[PDB]
């Protein structure tokens, strides 16, 4: 991009998130996060990093939303809790009225070009929706569907996602929109999503079938301690066999490590994370 090029507006709303999906994005190597913010998107609302605050920040988002009705991208980080009339997640206050996450998604959801559900919480419910929870934590696509909101959703899961999955999905979409316009472009994006709403360039390959320890798995050579890096990690709890992500190739944090080399995969991109991937440390 350039400092003077076309950059679509983005609002980033946090529901029941941990801010890890924002932090992971800050770790993008290429393009750098500075280049993303100054050359790729216009991040108009984001509570962790924006200059203004409070009702003034909410009203800024609402002014941009009106100007770009149907055309802004809405990122959701975290699940949407529906119990107690939305009171388990209040995201702001304007005009002496509290705004729950439920309220915010009903307000902005219908008017976004697309909703990017970033992270497993937003995509699938994640840890806030897991056994023992009591907030009605709900995935974005289910919440929107239950409320009759037809805006396209793209899931970019992981706990957290790799920055390349987030930036790369944005770039996918912007390439498709540049070739086909907004509706045609979003239709091309939807065509490359799997049955769990995930872009196949990043989630179309299985961890285990591409794992460098697969020969040890097939030989039955299993590490008995985490620090044995020769054997397969299956007995230590590795969930690679059930996980669709490209971590084996892309690795993490500038390529310096990844979960299977260091310890085990916990299946963090999968719709049943965490409960269907637990216990983490046995098969």
């Amino acid at each position: 991009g350039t400092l003077t090029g076309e950059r679509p507006p983005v609002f980033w709303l946090q529901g029941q998130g941990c801010t890890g999906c924002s932090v992971t994005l800050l770790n993008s190597v290429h393009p750098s996060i500075a280049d993303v913010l100054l050359k790729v998107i216009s991040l108009e609302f984001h509570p962790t990093v924006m200059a203004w605050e409070g009702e003034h920040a909410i009203e800024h988002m609402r002014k941009v939303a009106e100007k770009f009705k149907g055309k802004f991208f809405l990122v959701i980080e975290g699940s949407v809790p529906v119990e107690a009339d939305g009171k388990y997640c209040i995201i702001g206050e304007a005009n002496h009225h509290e705004i729950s996450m439920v309220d915010a998604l009903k307000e902005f959801g219908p008017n976004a070009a697309a909703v990017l559900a970033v992270g497993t919480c937003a995509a699938y419910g994640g840890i806030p929706a897991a056994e023992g929870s009591e907030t009605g934590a709900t995935a974005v696509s289910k919440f929107l569907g239950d409320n009759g909101i037809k805006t396209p959703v793209v899931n970019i899961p992981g706990c957290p996602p790799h920055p390349d999955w987030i930036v790369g999905t944005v770039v996918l979409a912007l390439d498709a929109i540049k070739k086909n316009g907004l509706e045609g472009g979003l239709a091309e994006v939807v065509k490359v999503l799997d049955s769990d709403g995930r872009p196949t360039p990043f989630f179309g390959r299985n961890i285990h079938e591409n794992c460098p320890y697969l020969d040890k798995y097939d030989e039955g050579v299993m590490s008995a301690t985490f620090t044995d890096k020769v054997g397969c990690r299956y007995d230590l709890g590795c969930k690679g066999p059930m996980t669709m992500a490209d971590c084996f190739e892309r690795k993490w944090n500038g390529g310096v490590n990844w979960c299977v080399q260091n310890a085990v995969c916990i299946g963090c991109v999968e719709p049943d994370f965490p409960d269907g991937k637990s216990p983490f440390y046995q098969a």
Binding site: T19, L37, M50, A84, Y88, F226
Partner: protein, 482 residues
């Protein structure tokens, strides 16, 4: 002038969901209420699980500080399981976690706090903002702030590469478990950690510590406000040997001008003004209970109200540096003299009033970052390439344990009780819980609520100092509520 009541929701350039409401009378804050508006309930989600799962689940309390929760969790599990962490694993854990102190403090000063003092470029998310934002820096110093904000984006990313070298990835490390650390450091990966560390060291020494004092010297009024209770807590962190009795930050309490020992049995969590069932009020964490009551009258937060022997205390870099009183950095000593006319050798030489202040908390965080450099350098000398870092303990049927550490924002403990080989109770008492909590059952304010008293608001239409004070404490409301 009379009263104006100002509500700020969301407070931005913090982590998580916070509303602040202040009463201003005659140009000063005279009352305050902080509300943590989002709840997840990790303490109930954890019940029934294999205890080893906790050291993954708990990290998702916060994406900024997951290594802190990882550390407290594995320490609690180590104790409950009777796991004897090998010496080299203790050091490896310190290298994983210490690297995120560098990341978090740099993130906080530049990417969260600096816009309080620095005008960013004329594009979102740096505009729009308050028309009278009280941005006092010369064109040159403002540009230095912007340039360093941009450089710091790379530096904080490098810090996460350091975490991931032995931690697997970041956010959310895989490399700390009950029994130690999952990956033995190799000679080659220690070279890689050290090469990155050198770059972070140079930025901290040459850019970050100097800019905090230099900006502070243009906002000297900000050392005169934000004192609150002038009361602090440290529970200890970064063990320096295998005895459990020696740590980089040693424990202590400071209140009403007096140093006192830290006794964790004196912690109680009150809920009168929190959205939890009234019958759970006043419990020590070993008997803690988490029963949400989002409709309870009079309550205003999902943060419980922790009190230490009845005292409302703050936590974080100021707290740790005040309790431990280390020597100041060379550049801090020099800039205190040159820019402030202050002769100081150790941290307490700033004096209680200036240390416990809005700007004093930014200074403490920069000084602590410099202090952490020497600790990491020491661990890079002490670590032994190739030496095993983990034991593999069996899960006990019945046990309890508590892990105590210091997250970048302050004191953190996790308590676990195991029954039938599963989590029976898990209770978390975190850093921003100590700072950003509401009133207790007696009506005594939380630490930040009290630190807001006296904050100047000369322009109710541009009340910038309210959130400036809050940001000095580096709030993380995901941690505060969990």
């Amino acid at each position: 002038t009379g009263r104006t009541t100002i509500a700020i929701d969301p407070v931005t350039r913090i982590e998580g969901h916070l509303k602040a409401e202040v009463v201003v009378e005659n140009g000063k804050v005279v009352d305050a209420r902080l509300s943590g508006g989002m709840y997840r309930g990790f303490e109930t989600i954890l019940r029934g699980r294999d205890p080893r799962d906790a050291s993954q689940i708990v990290q998702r309390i916060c994406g900024v500080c997951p290594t802190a929760h990882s550390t407290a969790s594995v320490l609690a599990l180590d104790e409950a399981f009777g796991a004897k962490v090998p010496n080299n694993g203790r050091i490896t854990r310190n290298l994983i976690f210490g690297a995120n102190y560098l990341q978090s403090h740099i993130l906080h000063f530049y990417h969260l706090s600096a816009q309080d003092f620095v005008q960013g470029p004329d594009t979102a998310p740096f505009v729009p903002r308050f028309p009278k934002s009280d941005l006092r820096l010369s064109k040159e110093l403002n540009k230095a702030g912007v340039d360093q904000y941009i450089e710091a984006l790379e530096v904080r990313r490098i810090c996460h590469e350091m975490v991931a070298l032995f931690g697997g990835r970041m956010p959310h490390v895989q490399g700390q478990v009950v029994g130690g650390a999952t990956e033995i450091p190799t000679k080659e990966k220690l070279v890689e950690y050290a090469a990155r560390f050198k770059k972070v060291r140079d930025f901290v020494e040459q850019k970050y510590v100097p800019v905090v004092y230099t900006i502070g010297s243009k906002y000297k009024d900000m050392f005169k406000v934000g004192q609150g209770f002038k009361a602090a807590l440290c529970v200890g962190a970064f063990p320096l040997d295998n005895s459990g009795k020696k740590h980089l930050f040693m424990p202590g309490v400071y209140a009403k001008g007096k140093d006192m020992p830290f006794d964790p049995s004196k912690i109680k969590e009150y809920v009168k003004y929190s959205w939890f069932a009234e019958e759970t009020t006043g419990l020590n964490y070993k008997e803690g209970k988490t029963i949400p009551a989002p409709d309870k009258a009079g309550a205003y937060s999902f943060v419980k109200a922790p009190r230490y022997d009845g005292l409302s205390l703050e936590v974080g870099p100021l707290a740790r540096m005040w309790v431990n009183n280390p020597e100041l950095s060379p550049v801090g000593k020099k800039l205190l003299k040159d820019l402030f006319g202050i002769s100081a050798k150790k941290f307490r030489d700033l004096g209680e009033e200036a240390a416990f202040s809005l700007m004093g908390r930014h200074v403490a965080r920069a000084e602590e970052t410099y202090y952490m450099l020497g600790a990491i350098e020491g661990w890079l000398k002490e670590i032994k390439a190739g030496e095993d870092t983990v034991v593999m303990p069996a899960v006990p049927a019945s046990a309890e344990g508590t892990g105590f550490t210091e997250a970048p924002r302050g004191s953190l403990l996790h308590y676990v009780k195991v029954k039938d080989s599963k989590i029976d109770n898990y209770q978390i008492v975190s850093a921003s819980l100590w700072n950003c909590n509401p009133r207790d059952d007696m009506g005594q304010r939380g630490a930040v609520e009290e630190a807001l008293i006296g904050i100047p608001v000369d322009d109710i239409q541009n009340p910038v100092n309210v959130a400036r004070l809050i940001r000095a404490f580096d709030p993380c409301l995901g941690c505060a509520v969990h």
